[PDB]
Amino acid sequence: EVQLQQSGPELVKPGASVKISCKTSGYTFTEYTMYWVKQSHGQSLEWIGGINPNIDDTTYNQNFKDKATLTVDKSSSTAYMEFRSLTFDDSAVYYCARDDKASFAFWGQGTLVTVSAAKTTPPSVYPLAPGSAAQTNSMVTLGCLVKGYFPEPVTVTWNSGSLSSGVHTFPAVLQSDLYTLSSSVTVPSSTWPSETVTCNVAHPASSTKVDKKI
Partner 1 sequence: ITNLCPFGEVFNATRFASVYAWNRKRISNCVADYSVLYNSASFSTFKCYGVSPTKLNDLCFTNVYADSFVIRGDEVRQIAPGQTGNIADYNYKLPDDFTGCVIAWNSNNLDSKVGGNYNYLYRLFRKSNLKPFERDISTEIYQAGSTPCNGVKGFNCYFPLQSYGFQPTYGVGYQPYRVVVLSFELLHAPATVCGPK
Partner 2 sequence: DIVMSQSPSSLAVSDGERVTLTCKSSQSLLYSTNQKNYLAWYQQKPGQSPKLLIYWASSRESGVPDRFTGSGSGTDFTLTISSVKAEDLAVYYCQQYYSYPLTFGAGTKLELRADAAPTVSIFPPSSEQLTSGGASVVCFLNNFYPKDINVKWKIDGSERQNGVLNSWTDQDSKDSTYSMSSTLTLTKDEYERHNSYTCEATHKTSTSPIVKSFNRN
Question: Is 102 a residue that touches partner 1 (CB under 8 A)?
Answer: yes
Residue 197 class from Cβ within 10 Å (0-12 exposed, 13-18 middle, 19+ buried)?
buried
Q: Are 210 and 121 in contact, with CB atoms under 8 Å apart?
A: no
Q: Which is nearer to partner 1, 22 or 154 (CB)?
A: 22
57's contact among partner 2, partner 1, none, with CB below 5 to 8 A by partner kind, is partner 1
Q: Does 59 bind partner 1 (CB under 8 A)?
A: yes
Which lies closer to partner 1 via its Cβ, residue 102 or residue 134? 102
By CB under 8 A, tell whether 33 contacts partner 1: yes
**Amino acid identity of 134?**
A
Q: Which residues bind partner 2 (CB under 8 A)?
A: 35, 37, 43-47, 59, 61-62, 95, 102-105, 107-110, 124, 126-131, 137, 141, 143, 145, 168-173, 175, 180-182, 184, 186
Pick the stretch among 37-45, 49-57, 121-129, 185-193 that binds partner 1 (CB under 8 A): 49-57
Q: What is the DSSP letter of 15?
A: T
CA count, 13 A, side-chain hemisphere, 34 = 30
| Least CB distance to partner 1 at residue 93 (A) | 24
CA 105 to chain centre: 24
φ/ψ of residue 23, rounded to 5: -90, 135
Could you give the CA distance from residue 94 to residue 36 in angstroms, rounded to a whole number? 7
The residues that touch partner 1, with contacts defined as CB under 8 A, are: 33, 50, 52, 54, 57, 59, 99, 102
